[PDB]
Structure formats: C-alpha cells, structure tokens
Write an enzyme that holds these catalytic residues in place. Sequence first.
Site, mmCIF file in Angstrom:
data_model
loop_
_atom_site.group_PDB
_atom_site.id
_atom_site.type_symbol
_atom_site.label_atom_id
_atom_site.label_comp_id
_atom_site.label_asym_id
_atom_site.label_seq_id
_atom_site.Cartn_x
_atom_site.Cartn_y
_atom_site.Cartn_z
ATOM 1 N N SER A 437 0.820 -1.232 0.000
ATOM 2 C CA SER A 437 0.000 0.000 0.000
ATOM 3 C C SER A 437 0.842 1.264 0.000
ATOM 4 O O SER A 437 1.785 1.377 0.787
ATOM 5 C CB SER A 437 -0.922 0.042 1.227
ATOM 6 O OG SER A 437 -0.176 0.326 2.406
ATOM 7 N N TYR A 520 -12.820 2.868 14.338
ATOM 8 C CA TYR A 520 -13.779 1.780 14.444
ATOM 9 C C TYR A 520 -13.688 0.828 13.300
ATOM 10 O O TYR A 520 -13.096 1.143 12.278
ATOM 11 C CB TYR A 520 -15.208 2.276 14.552
ATOM 12 C CG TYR A 520 -15.503 3.272 15.620
ATOM 13 C CD1 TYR A 520 -14.650 3.505 16.725
ATOM 14 C CD2 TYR A 520 -16.687 3.948 15.603
ATOM 15 C CE1 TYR A 520 -14.974 4.467 17.718
ATOM 16 C CE2 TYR A 520 -17.021 4.841 16.609
ATOM 17 C CZ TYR A 520 -16.150 5.124 17.641
ATOM 18 O OH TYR A 520 -16.584 6.067 18.612
ATOM 19 N N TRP A 565 -10.693 -11.092 11.827
ATOM 20 C CA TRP A 565 -11.252 -9.738 11.768
ATOM 21 C C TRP A 565 -12.661 -9.694 11.225
ATOM 22 O O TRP A 565 -13.147 -8.645 10.813
ATOM 23 C CB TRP A 565 -10.314 -8.870 10.951
ATOM 24 C CG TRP A 565 -8.966 -8.622 11.610
ATOM 25 C CD1 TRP A 565 -8.568 -9.024 12.879
ATOM 26 C CD2 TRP A 565 -7.876 -7.857 11.080
ATOM 27 N NE1 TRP A 565 -7.309 -8.553 13.133
ATOM 28 C CE2 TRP A 565 -6.867 -7.839 12.045
ATOM 29 C CE3 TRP A 565 -7.652 -7.204 9.869
ATOM 30 C CZ2 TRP A 565 -5.639 -7.214 11.831
ATOM 31 C CZ3 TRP A 565 -6.427 -6.538 9.666
ATOM 32 C CH2 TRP A 565 -5.449 -6.550 10.651
ATOM 33 N N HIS A 691 5.315 3.626 10.786
ATOM 34 C CA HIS A 691 4.337 4.448 11.502
ATOM 35 C C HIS A 691 4.839 5.863 11.840
ATOM 36 O O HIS A 691 4.212 6.542 12.650
ATOM 37 C CB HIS A 691 3.872 3.734 12.790
ATOM 38 C CG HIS A 691 3.096 2.463 12.559
ATOM 39 N ND1 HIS A 691 3.671 1.213 12.643
ATOM 40 C CD2 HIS A 691 1.782 2.251 12.302
ATOM 41 C CE1 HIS A 691 2.754 0.288 12.425
ATOM 42 N NE2 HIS A 691 1.597 0.892 12.220
HETATM 43 C C1 C2F Z 1 -4.493 -2.705 10.582
HETATM 44 N N1 C2F Z 1 -5.544 -2.900 11.575
HETATM 45 C C2 C2F Z 1 -6.797 -3.392 11.247
HETATM 46 C C3 C2F Z 1 -7.471 -4.255 12.244
HETATM 47 N N2 C2F Z 1 -8.710 -4.733 11.961
HETATM 48 C C4 C2F Z 1 -9.316 -4.456 10.783
HETATM 49 N N3 C2F Z 1 -10.546 -4.979 10.550
HETATM 50 N N4 C2F Z 1 -8.726 -3.692 9.840
HETATM 51 C C5 C2F Z 1 -7.514 -3.129 9.995
HETATM 52 O O1 C2F Z 1 -6.994 -2.421 9.108
HETATM 53 N N5 C2F Z 1 -6.818 -4.532 13.405
HETATM 54 C C6 C2F Z 1 -5.445 -4.068 13.602
HETATM 55 C C7 C2F Z 1 -5.350 -2.661 13.019
HETATM 56 C C8 C2F Z 1 -6.503 -1.805 13.621
HETATM 57 N N6 C2F Z 1 -6.451 -0.512 13.016
HETATM 58 C C9 C2F Z 1 -7.442 0.145 12.401
HETATM 59 C C10 C2F Z 1 -7.000 1.266 11.708
HETATM 60 C C11 C2F Z 1 -7.888 2.052 11.002
HETATM 61 C C12 C2F Z 1 -9.236 1.720 10.954
HETATM 62 C C13 C2F Z 1 -10.097 2.640 10.133
HETATM 63 O O2 C2F Z 1 -9.571 3.027 9.080
HETATM 64 N N7 C2F Z 1 -11.314 3.025 10.587
HETATM 65 C C14 C2F Z 1 -12.171 4.067 9.969
HETATM 66 C C15 C2F Z 1 -13.398 3.541 9.205
HETATM 67 C C16 C2F Z 1 -13.038 2.363 8.305
HETATM 68 C C17 C2F Z 1 -13.813 2.309 6.995
HETATM 69 O O3 C2F Z 1 -14.461 3.267 6.556
HETATM 70 O O4 C2F Z 1 -13.762 1.171 6.287
HETATM 71 C C18 C2F Z 1 -12.668 5.066 10.991
HETATM 72 O O5 C2F Z 1 -12.527 6.268 10.832
HETATM 73 O O6 C2F Z 1 -13.276 4.678 12.104
HETATM 74 C C19 C2F Z 1 -9.697 0.583 11.639
HETATM 75 C C20 C2F Z 1 -8.799 -0.209 12.371
HETATM 76 C C1 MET Z 2 -1.207 -4.840 7.363
HETATM 77 S S1 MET Z 2 -0.275 -5.996 6.405
HETATM 78 C C2 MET Z 2 0.248 -5.336 4.855
HETATM 79 C C3 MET Z 2 -1.017 -5.158 4.028
HETATM 80 C C4 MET Z 2 -0.823 -4.516 2.656
HETATM 81 N N1 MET Z 2 0.049 -5.308 1.795
HETATM 82 C C5 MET Z 2 -0.270 -3.125 2.810
HETATM 83 O O1 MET Z 2 0.959 -2.870 2.406
HETATM 84 O O2 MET Z 2 -0.941 -2.239 3.306
#
Ligand code: C2F
Ligand code: MET
Length: 750
Positions: A437, A520, A565, A691
């Site tokens: 990504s 979330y 997940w 990060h």
């Molecule tokens: C990589 N991570 C991740 C996970 N679990 C899930 N399902 N997806 C993930 O990307 N567990 C570990 C970590 C948790 N981190 C995250 C990080 C960001 C969001 C996120 O982008 N939330 C948005 C809405 C998501 C959407 O629109 O699809 C938000 O603003 O609440 C969720 C979990």
């Molecule tokens: C969170 S694991 C890596 C997932 C994906 N290949 C990315 O680079 O975002």
Amino acid sequence: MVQSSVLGFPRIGGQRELKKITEAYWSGKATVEELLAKGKELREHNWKLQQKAGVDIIPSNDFSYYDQVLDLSLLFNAIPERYTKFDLAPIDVLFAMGRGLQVTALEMVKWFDSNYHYVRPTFSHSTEFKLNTAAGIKPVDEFNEAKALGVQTRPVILGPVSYLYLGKADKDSLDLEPISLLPKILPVYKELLQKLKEAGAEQVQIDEPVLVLDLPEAVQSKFKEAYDALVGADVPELILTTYFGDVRPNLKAIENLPVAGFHFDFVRVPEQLDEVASILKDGQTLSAGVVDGRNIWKTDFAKASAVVQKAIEKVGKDKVVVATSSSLLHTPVDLESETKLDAVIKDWFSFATQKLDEVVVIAKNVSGEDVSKQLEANAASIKARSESSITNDPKVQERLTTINEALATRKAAFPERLTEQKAKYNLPLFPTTTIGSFPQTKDIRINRNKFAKGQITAEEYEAFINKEIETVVRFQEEIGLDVLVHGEPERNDMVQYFGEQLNGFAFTTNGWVQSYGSRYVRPPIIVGDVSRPKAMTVKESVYAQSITSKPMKGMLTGPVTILRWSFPRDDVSGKIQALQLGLALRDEVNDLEGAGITVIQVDEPAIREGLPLRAGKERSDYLNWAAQSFRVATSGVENSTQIHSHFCYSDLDPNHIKALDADVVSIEFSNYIQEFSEYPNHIGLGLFDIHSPRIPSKQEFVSRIEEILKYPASKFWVNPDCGLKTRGWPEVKESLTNMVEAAKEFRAKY
Ligand SMILES: CN1c2c(nc(N)[nH]c2=O)NC[C@@H]1CNc1ccc(C(=O)N[C@@H](CCC(=O)O)C(=O)O)cc1
Ligand code: MET
Ligand SMILES: [Zn+2]
C-alpha cells in the site's frame, strides 16, 4: 428471582456519535463542554436502554472518551512526567497519552484475543499513585449521574493485579517489575472504593481477566494479598470478574478470597462451571456469563438457560445471576439500524441492544416465569438457521474432504524452487521490495463514490484506478525497486475487500465496533460455508503487470486474518472456517498465477491475535491449522511461482514461519535472526518503521544490513515494516531511494 447483568455497554453511539464529537473536539470544531454534553447524553441513553430492557445490574464507568484502562491510569496518577509540562487540563492529558501530541502516544496493545486495543499502563520508579479530586472522580461522578436519573449502577473497574500485570515499565525505569508496585497501589483502590461506597454504590464489578492467562505462582499469590486488603465494611461488595477463557489453572489463587462473588465466561468455556462453582464460599454469588459479549449470533435461550440451571443446581437460585459473558464493548450497538439485511438472516443475529433483552428473558425463564412465547420464537429462529442453505454448501463440504498433505505441500522443496526462480526472475542479491500500500489521492474516493451512486461507469472508474496504478508502478520503476506492488488503490479494508467477494458472508451498514480510540471497524460476518465464485483481485494485478517488465506482486489477505477480523460462525470451529477460506484463496492464487501473476504475497497480520490465551493443545493445534490453511492457499503453484508472506508481529514463533515454507517472508523487525540461519527460504527483516516520518540515510540503512549480516547475504531482502498507506509521497520518495541506494552498495560489493 434470578437477576440479569451486563458487564459493559459499547459507548460509540447508535450513530457513531462518540466518534464525531471526539473528532470534532480534537480538530477544534467543538468545545470541551459540548464534548462533555454528548458524553452525558450517551450515558443517559445507554443507562435508560438497559433499565427499559429490564436489566437488574447495570454498569457504570464502562463509558470512555478513549480507553477505560487509560481512564484508570489518569485516575490513579500513572501519568508520566512528559505529558505534564504542557499546561494541559487533565482531559487533555488524557488525549495526549492516548493519541500523542505535536511526544509519542503510549503504546496501543491488543486486549487479550479481541480486536479491541487498550493503552498500556506505563510505570516508573518515581510514579506516585493517588486519586485527584480536581480532575473529577470519573467512576464516582458517573455513578452519581446515573443515580440522579433513578438508575442504580455497578461501577466497573479493572482490578489491581490485572492493571499492574498488563502495564509495562517506562524507558527510564527498565528494570522494574510492574507486579511489584502492588503495595503502592492498593491504598488508592481502597480509597476509591470507600468513596464509591459513600456515594451509594453497593456492588462493584472488579475485572481480573488475567486469571484466564498462564500466570506464575508468584503472581497467583497476589489475589489473596490484594483482596484481603480491599474488602471491608467501609467498601462496596466486590464481584471479581473474569472473561475470555478458563480460570481453572489459577483456581487456588482465588478459592479463599473475601469477595462477595465471581463472574465467569461460560460461552467461551462452559466446561469450567463445575470446578469454579465448587469453590464458592457461603454467601458468594456466581455470575454466569452466557450471552456472548464478542459475537453477534442470537443466543440459544434453551442452551444458555441449561448452563444457568447447572449453576443453580450447584449453588442455589438466589446466588446465581444471568450475565453477558464479557462487556458488550466488542459488539455493535443496534441490529435495528440494519436497513439492507435479509430478514431471514437478520433473524439469526443479536447486537448489543438485543442482547439486553436476551439476559432478561433468560433470567425470567430460569426464575420460573412463563416466557414460553419468546422461547418459542427463539427456538424457531435457531431451528431456521441450522437448516438454511445459506449455511449448507455441499460442494464446499466435499472439497474439505480433499484436504491432505499434498494439497498443503509445494511440488518441490525450497532449494529446488530457488533454482527455477533465479532462472525465471534472475533477481540481484539484496532484492528491493515494498509491502503493497502507498499514499492515496483525493480523486480516489470521489471516483469510488461517483461509481457507487452510478455517476461514472464501471468503464470510467476502472480507468481512473489504472491511472492510479500506472502512477504507482511508474514511480517504483524510476526508483529502481526489483519486485513491485500495485498500491492497492481499488481497496477498502484488507478483509472486507475479500469478504464482499466471497460466498458465506454478510455485511452490515451500521455494525460498528471500537478497535482503538475514535477508530472503528465494521467487521464482515461469516454466516455459512465459504467459497469464492470468481476472480477477486486479478484484473488490477493483470493491469499493473501489463504496464511493466518488472515482476508484480499480487496481494492477498490470508485466511486466518479474514477469520479473525470477521465475526465468525459459532456453529463450526475456527479451524473449519480457516480451511474453507484457504480453499477459496487457493482458487484466487491459481487464477493469479494463470493470468501470469507468478509472484504473490499473502498478509497474515492477525496470526498472533488468534493465539489461544494458554499454552497447551489448543495453542499448538492453532499453529498447525493456521499454517495449514496458509499452505492450502499457496501450495497449488509451480516451483517458479514465488510466494511471499508478510507479518506485523516481530516476536512471531520462528517455527510457525518455517512451517509456512514461503519463498520469502517479510516481518516487522526494527539474536532471533539466528533461528533462521540454516532455514533456506528468504527473509526481509523489516529494516524500518512504517508508523512515522524521519527518512533514514544510506548508513542508517547501511549499518542495519551489516548488523543483520553479522544471517547470510544470499537470503536477505530489503523492505520496510509494512505498507505506506499511512504516510505521504515526499517522505516515501527518499526512504525508498535511500533504501535502494543502500542495497545497491552491498550489491555492488561482490
Ligand atoms: C491494521 N488494523 C486493522 C485491524 N482490523 C481491521 N478490521 N482492519 C484493519 O486495518 N486490526 C489491527 C489494526 C486496527 N487498526 C485500524 C485502523 C484504522 C481503521 C479505520 O480506518 N477506521 C475508519 C473507518 C473504516 C472504513 O471506513 O472502512 C474510521 O474512521 O473509524 C480501523 C482499524
Ligand atoms: C497490514 S499488512 C500489509 C497489508 C498490505 N500489503 C499493505 O501494504 O498495506
Ligand atoms: Zn505489516
């Protein structure tokens, strides 16, 4: 009559109100006081919901603006100095510690095997534990707020042992054992319980979930010490509360405690009942957790009631309480918000609001009340689910039988594979790659949207995405990376993107759960036998590969991560779910390879998260089946197809890695490297932190590869910790050139 109990209620709001107000607060758009006003409103509404449903024991202090552990850290003064010299009001010290300050946030950690994350309690030698009045006394104040609405509540706090045991020593105090601060903190809990008692709190739920973990003897003795010190006439009765697993190996630590009662999780471990019941003292109550706090399936009222009745039989009806298994934090707020679900399907589910009604109905049924209407409706819903073809896929069942050794083994061992791959790709030593990504542009979402509302065509949006892939591949080429990715611009969540394209799944419009902070997730739900009817990712990788001579990585999320997940089925094992997923992903890998995408990477970021909480048979079967499902997905390919795997957990059991037999494994890793000395397959120990900014130099990188080579060079790939979705284009430019340029040096030293 048997009382009903709820261990916690999700606080995000039916309309994600909590997110919007907290985000608006942080971004300047809302005042602190408008923030507190939404808070009261949320608590009031959630209390009222529970009262109206008829729940007897109703939690308070379960609410939070961020994280409940953090709230306790703020409340006991576990607040490191650095956070204190910016004149921040305590609520703003709160937010500093959780989400950093333009100073890094404290560490985010997985709360047991959920996908909720807590803020690490952090402790120094200098830490002085005290309540602070002027910050307000959150558990007292919220208990008073609910009483004034005419709702008596039971404060929830994490107990001392668990709080200490889950925290860590701060940088400056490296040698400290948090467990050792126990004398220093008990007085403060005591005083807090004294003040909760003064306010009129008669019972308090004290969470000690680390009892479901493998604990050292030395840590087990601490329950008697802790609780001997708290219980008294000047404090509320204490219900020592455990959830997520089996307390039996620690049973001695708690069989002579002066608490008023206990809660256990009979959803995850019904079989512990008899033993844990056997140690109840005269007068102690037993809270029987029988409505799942972590999944969304309508409870079987007959079976849950029979669990509660088994406890009644051992202990007496006046000493049992029907409970949610854990806080409902880990479930969505309200099923009735779901506008798109089939009524047939929706009849299988219950979210947090519906689960209130379930514990009440269950309590009544075992009390002796006629609730035969509900029982009949419930029994009817359960019977319908277990018959539906939405769950009965004869093809998948047959395919499961075909699973064997061969199907989870490559055609040749790695040394033989490496020869065919050196000839086919002829990659240079120290090959350079990235995880998948990249940063993303505004045109993206609007374009996604327009195509969702029908505004642009599929043959408009498909071209908007290919230009974005073209931008992404062109960049890598001029940068000189060897193995390329496509940037994943067509992708939302790395799970939902797959779930939407898989049979056996359902999605919600509003099934939101808090993952961490204001952030979330809306997990997919597995409702039935899973399969993949067609190509999920092929078109985009085929396009990216057609635009360049360099090898293009296709990109999949592995089966364990899709399972972990999502909300899983509770009528079949995780394992079976994972293997169905392995087989569906196998078809995808095969189509990829068939389309000329012969490098393919598989991401399993949730492998550690699904690790059973105790060592034993359950833990090693998981690793076998987790590895086996991965291999079922990746073993149908030719010896010249290169299988990559990426992991985010740096402390991942070397043997699980070897068990995969990936040609290449990339791992977050900013000693242990030696475990792989004589393992043939290749490895990119993540050389730098995805990060944050701070683009490291030639020798920042350089020192690394020599320091890592202190592991043989024929096997080393150069790559970062993860994708760069969470970063910007400038800082990505240099990092990656500095990374490549660093590699070029070693490479051009042979
Ligand atoms: C990589 N991570 C991740 C996970 N679990 C899930 N399902 N997806 C993930 O990307 N567990 C570990 C970590 C948790 N981190 C995250 C990080 C960001 C969001 C996120 O982008 N939330 C948005 C809405 C998501 C959407 O629109 O699809 C938000 O603003 O609440 C969720 C979990
Ligand atoms: C969170 S694991 C890596 C997932 C994906 N290949 C990315 O680079 O975002
Ligand atoms: Zn990662």
